[PDB]
Amino acid sequence: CPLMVKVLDAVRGSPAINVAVHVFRKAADDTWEPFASGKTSESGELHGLTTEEQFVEGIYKVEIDTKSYWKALGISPFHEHAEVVFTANDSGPRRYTIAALLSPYSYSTTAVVTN
Amino acid sequence: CPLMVKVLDAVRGSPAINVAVHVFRKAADDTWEPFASGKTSESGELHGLTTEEQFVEGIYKVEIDTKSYWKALGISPFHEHAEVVFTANDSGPRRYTIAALLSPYSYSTTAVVT
Amino acid sequence: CPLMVKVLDAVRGSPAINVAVHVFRKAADDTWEPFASGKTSESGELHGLTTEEQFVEGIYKVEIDTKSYWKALGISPFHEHAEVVFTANDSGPRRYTIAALLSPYSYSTTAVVT
Amino acid sequence: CPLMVKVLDAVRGSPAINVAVHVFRKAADDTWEPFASGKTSESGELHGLTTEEQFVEGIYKVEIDTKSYWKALGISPFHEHAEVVFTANDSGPRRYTIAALLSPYSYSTTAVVTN
Numbered sequence A, D: 001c002p003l004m005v006k007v008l009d010a011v012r013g014s015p016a017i018n019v020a021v022h023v024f025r026k027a028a029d030d031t032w033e034p035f036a037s038g039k040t041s042e043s044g045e046l047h048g049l050t051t052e053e054q055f056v057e058g059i060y061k062v063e064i065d066t067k068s069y070w071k072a073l074g075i076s077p078f079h080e081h082a083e084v085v086f087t088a089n090d091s092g093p094r095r096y097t098i099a100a101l102l103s104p105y106s107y108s109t110t111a112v113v114t115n
Numbered sequence B, C: 001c002p003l004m005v006k007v008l009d010a011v012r013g014s015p016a017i018n019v020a021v022h023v024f025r026k027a028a029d030d031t032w033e034p035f036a037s038g039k040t041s042e043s044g045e046l047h048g049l050t051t052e053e054q055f056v057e058g059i060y061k062v063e064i065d066t067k068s069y070w071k072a073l074g075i076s077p078f079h080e081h082a083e084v085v086f087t088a089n090d091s092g093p094r095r096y097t098i099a100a101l102l103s104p105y106s107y108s109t110t111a112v113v114t
C-alpha cells in the first residue's frame, strides 16, 4: 500500500466516510489519465488504491469529492472538490499518506512520506 | 498596534464576530496576569489591545473563547477555548498578527510577524 | 475587488511574497480558460485580478505556484502547486477572499465570503 | 486507550517523534493537576496515557512541547507550546484522538471522538 488517503471531518470530529476519491496520473501528452479510485471506509481511510509495481514515478493528482460529502450532510460547501497534486517516486519508491481535514469553507491537506 | 488578533469561521466562511479574547502576560511569579481583552469586530479583527510602550518582552497568552461562539450558533464544540502562548522578542520593529481559523472540532492558529 | 487572494508562509511567519497565482474559468466545453493572473505583493496579497462586471457566475480555479516559492527558499516541497476550485454564486453583494497557508508538506486554504 | 495523541511535522512531512506531551486535569479548586505524560513514538503517536477507569469526566488540558521539538531541528518557533483544552466524557465514556499538525509559526489541532 504505497498510497493511502485519509479524510477527516472537522465539523463533526469524525472520519469522513464514503468520500469518493479519484486518482490520476499525468500522461506523456500532459493529459490526466484515470489511475485509481475508491471511497473512504468507516475509518475515513482508503487503502489498496495501487501496488508498488504500478505506482511508478510521475505526477499524480488525488481528487477528493468534498462537495458531495457536505451536500449529503445538508451543508452548502465552498469548494467543488479538494485536489492534491504531487510528483511521486522521483528518487525511488516511497509510501505516501495523503490526509485531508475538511470544513465547509476550508480544508487542509498534509502528506506524510516514508520509505 | 503591535498586536492584532483575527478570528475566522471555517464553517460559514466568514469573520468570527463578537468573539471574546483575553490576553495575559506571565508575571515574575509564573502567574498569568490580565493584560488586555476585547471582542472581535464585524471584520473578525481585534485592534488596539495594547501599545508598543506597554507591550514589553515577555511570555503572553491569548485566549479565544471559541466555546461561546459555537454555542451561540447552536453547535456543540470540542474545545473549551483556543490558546496561543508565545514569547514577544522585541528585536527590531515587529507587529504580531495572531489568526485563528475555527471549526467545531478543529482550529488552526497562525502568527504573521512583520 | 470581488476576488482577492492572500498567501502566508507558516514556516517563517510572514506573508508569502512574489507567489505566482493563475486564475481560470471553466469554459462551456469543460476546458479551463485563462482568466487572470498576478503575483502576491509584499503583504502576501493579490488585488485587482478582476472586476464585478467580468466576474460572472461560473466555476473558477485558482492555482497557486507553491513549488517555485519553496524552491526559492531552498526547501523541497511536496505539492506541485495548490489549487482552489469553487463556484461563484453571485446571489447578492459578495466579495471572495481566498487564503492559503503554506508549509512544505501541507497547506490549508480557506474562503471568507462577505 | 481512551486518549491518544498524534503529532505530525508539516515541514518535513513526517511524524513528529520524541515530542513531550503533558496531560492535566482540572481539580475541584480550578487548579491544573498532573494527569499523565509521555513522548510520541516513531509513528508520532502516544498511546497508553490512561485507562477508561481513570479517565473520568472533567476538563483536561493536553500540552504539547512544540518549542523543544523545533529547537532540536534548528528552527526558532513562534509558540511556547500547543495546548488543547476540552471537557471529556460528560455524556459517557468516549475514545479521543487528539492530533496536532505542526509548523514553526502555525499549528492546527483536531479531535476525532468515537464510542
Ligand SMILES: O=C(O)c1cccc2c1oc1c(C(=O)O)cccc12
Binding pocket: B006, B008, B097, B099, B110, B112, C006, C008, C097, C098, C099, C110, C111, C112
Ligand atoms: O484577510 C483575510 O481576508 C484573511 C482570510 C482568511 C485567512 C486569513 C486572512 O488574513 C490572515 C492572516 C494575516 O492577515 O496576518 C494570517 C493568517 C490567516 C489569514
